[PDB]
Nucleic acid binder design. Sequence first.
RNA 1: UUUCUUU
RNA 2: GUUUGCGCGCCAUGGGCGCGCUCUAACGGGUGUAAGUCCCGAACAUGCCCAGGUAGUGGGAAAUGUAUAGCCGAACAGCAAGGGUGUCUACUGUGAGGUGGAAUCUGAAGGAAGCUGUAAGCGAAUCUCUGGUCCGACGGACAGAAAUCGCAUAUAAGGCUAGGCUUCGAGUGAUAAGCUGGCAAAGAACAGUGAAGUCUAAUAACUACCAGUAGAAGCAGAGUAAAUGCGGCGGAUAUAUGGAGAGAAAGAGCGUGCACCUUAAGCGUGGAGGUCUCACAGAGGUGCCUAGUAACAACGAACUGUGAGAAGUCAGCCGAGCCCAUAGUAGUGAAGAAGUCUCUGUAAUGGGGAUGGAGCGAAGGGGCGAACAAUCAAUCAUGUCUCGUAUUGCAGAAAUGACAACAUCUGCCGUAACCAAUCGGGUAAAAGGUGGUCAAAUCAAGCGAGACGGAAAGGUAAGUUGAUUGAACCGCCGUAUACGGAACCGUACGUACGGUGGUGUGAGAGGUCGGAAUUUCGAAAUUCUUCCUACUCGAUUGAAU
Length: 388
Amino acid sequence: SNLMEQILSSDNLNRAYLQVVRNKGAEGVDGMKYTELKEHLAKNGETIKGQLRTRKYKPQPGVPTVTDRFIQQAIAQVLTPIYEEQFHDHSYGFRPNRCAQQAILTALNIMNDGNDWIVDIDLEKFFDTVNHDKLMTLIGRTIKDGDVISIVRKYLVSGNLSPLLANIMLNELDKEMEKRGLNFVRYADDCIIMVGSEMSANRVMRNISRFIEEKLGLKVNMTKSKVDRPSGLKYLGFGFYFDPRAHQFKAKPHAKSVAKFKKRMKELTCRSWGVSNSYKVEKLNQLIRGWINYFKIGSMKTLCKELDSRIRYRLRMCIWKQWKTPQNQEKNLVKLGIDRNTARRVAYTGKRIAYVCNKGAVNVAISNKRLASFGLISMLDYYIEKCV
RNA sequence: UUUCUUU
RNA sequence: GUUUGCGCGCCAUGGGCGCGCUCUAACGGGUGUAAGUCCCGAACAUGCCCAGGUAGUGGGAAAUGUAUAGCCGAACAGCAAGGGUGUCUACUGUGAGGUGGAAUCUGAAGGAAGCUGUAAGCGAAUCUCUGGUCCGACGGACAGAAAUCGCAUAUAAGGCUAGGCUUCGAGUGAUAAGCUGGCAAAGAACAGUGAAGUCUAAUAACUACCAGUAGAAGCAGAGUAAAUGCGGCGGAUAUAUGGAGAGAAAGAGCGUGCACCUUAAGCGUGGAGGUCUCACAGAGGUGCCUAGUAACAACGAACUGUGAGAAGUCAGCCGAGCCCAUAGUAGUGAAGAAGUCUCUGUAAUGGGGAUGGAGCGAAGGGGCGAACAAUCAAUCAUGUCUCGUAUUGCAGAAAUGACAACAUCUGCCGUAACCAAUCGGGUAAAAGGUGGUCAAAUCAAGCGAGACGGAAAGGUAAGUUGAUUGAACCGCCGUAUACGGAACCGUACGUACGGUGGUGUGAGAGGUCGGAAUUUCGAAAUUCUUCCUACUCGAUUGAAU
Ligand SMILES: [Ca+2]
Ligand SMILES: [Ca+2]
Ligand SMILES: [Ca+2]
Ligand SMILES: [Ca+2]
Ligand SMILES: [Ca+2]
Ligand SMILES: [Ca+2]
Ligand SMILES: [Ca+2]
Ligand SMILES: [Ca+2]
Ligand SMILES: [Ca+2]
Ligand SMILES: [Ca+2]
Ligand SMILES: [Ca+2]
Ligand SMILES: [Ca+2]
Ligand SMILES: [Ca+2]
Ligand SMILES: [N+]
Ligand SMILES: [N+]
């Protein structure tokens, strides 16, 4: 019919195929490729369109098969309209042109607006817990084409459609929390509410947990769902703090996120990797660019100084270990600039790698400037350029 | 900072 | 690829068992039949202490040295026969090449059984007790294996480095195997600590000069890993292991023997296979040429025999056995070979004994290849779907009802003179506004869920036989045999033989020009890739590409 032809338009299906090419995904439960998807749509696209129009297509069984990924992408690219008009302004997750940094900025705006007390709410394992009939009556309450309802229900009995389904079922919660008058910031199944006082935050936690367990039919993980103050608040990788200058709360990378970055950096700058130090520096540059590009709305200037010093120190160990022989270490320390009468003495401390790379002649030869010329982007100046 | 040797 | 790494023979300057001769505790003394042993005497300089913070004089407790016969000779020097070099050369050859010199590297951890001088170290039967270390394979520690047990261990257990906090709190110290020094492993140096016992616990301070604490227990972290750590049992312990206690106890040097044993860079000798050169006849190309491009392959005429020559081998990884040639030759064997019989041993390789009367028997490089390990191929009712009938899970609208009582969000109270636990309470804390709430007879959208039914149709391999791949490496253990450096870690897994796990295909170039495509007719060009090559690099303890 009309909306189902809007699903199965030629430009829409070509856009879905190009988008699933850009995703570069893997095989499903049977085993095929995206170029195999291309020859599949070349030979068998009309049968797929006929089965979708005639309500006979059956899904396949985590990762979906790539023809189901393509069909789900088509359904997502038609259904991100009117739903996206209907969604809330504070639903900052799995939507076009919205990202996590906007969620953290909105949370900081509401936190500085006077609402300190946080109702963190943890919805446990959403996509299996939800009742299918309620979700399909929501979908039928916005759209009235039976065939798209049929294929989405067959998919829920069995992707890029599941984030949109999560946004529908939690858009019900957002409409309720706009009806009550609550301020909130909600990434996809990560919702935090902002209350003025702590017992009112307990009451809001109790009432919203009652509403979620009764009306949405979801399960609230009461072990992790807690009432806080914006200091023990982990949200989207960001922790929050209060400046002594009594004007603003501010975001920062939480200690779990800093620990994840430090673990990844220690894996990239491991001393015994057989790759060249240019490869370690390039992987470090990719990780540093990604970490700062996610977190740059926080304040980590001291943290970026410390992490830059630690990255440089581990790179001094990698370069000193790759030299691997005291004659070669003495030759390279003379070549980099350290005088031979001292370079031989440091090089015949060939072991004690952390001790010699901590300070001294190896600090002077492999300086900050030599590593900066080597291609190691500093965390501090990259954060300075990429901040406000 | 071992003005050393080897796997 | 690699300094060398092969076979056979010889030789001890190594070792064993005996004999002799001469020594043995600074220098001396005693005990005693006998002292090398048991015991007692003197200084001297060091170490440590008299601190109070070091540097000098006066002193004091342990310990060491001069100072046992002697051994050993550094990761210490010097000499150094020999060995290598796309290096420069003088001669010599028709040439492959061979010499003799210079330069430089090397002279090695496995036989010039290299030489000389040292620092440092060591230096006495046997027994008992004890500390430390090491071993009882390897394998992130499983499996497999002939292989000590149990637990823990990659977020990184564990160690270590630099701090922090909280409680203690200076004062005995020597002797020193070992441990640790921010981690792949081991050794050496230096530094700090330091188990076990044992010995000490004594002295007395000035002349210049410089201004609780030191230190450990405990706790949370931070940083740092090519992974082992802890405990039990058993064993080793001549780096003459740190000691302690008995011990009238042996230790060392030299010479000499043995029908004694053994050795990888010493001496003599042997090098096939392949590679290369030259000459003589053929085969060709133009009387003269035969190769080149690392080999393979290909261009071209550059191919063959035969004979004389030259350099030269010698690296476990899936290989029992066989073939080519040096070669049944050197060598070995009458001091007893092969065969035969009989005691025995190992996980496997073995070792005696008795007959016997002549055998056994190499080197390097290719080829075939049983077997092993993977991989591959060949052989050998439900459930639809189509009509139903009774239901059903979830929306929504509203005739009527009942009770006004529920849902919801801004959450403080007295104080003090003004305190958010900053004062006492309390977290559905009081005062509050906002929407009234619930049941819906019935009708009803859409996707499903399933029941009762009539109805379309439906329901071998194991084994064995082949073929391909297993290129290169990492080790480890038993016996024999040598070294650095006893142990550990190494010497190509040290090497030879015998066991045993693990990783699985570096780059360029050349070829195969197979495989894939784009262009033209699977054939030509191009790009990536499979297969072959120690030519050129890349390593070297692995691993990595
Ligand atoms: Ca080696
Ligand atoms: Ca001496
Ligand atoms: Ca061992
Ligand atoms: Ca091990
Ligand atoms: Ca640790
Ligand atoms: Ca001693
Ligand atoms: Ca030698
Ligand atoms: Ca010759
Ligand atoms: Ca092999
Ligand atoms: Ca190697
Ligand atoms: Ca070893
Ligand atoms: Ca090796
Ligand atoms: Ca060698
Ligand atoms: N070699
Ligand atoms: N090896």
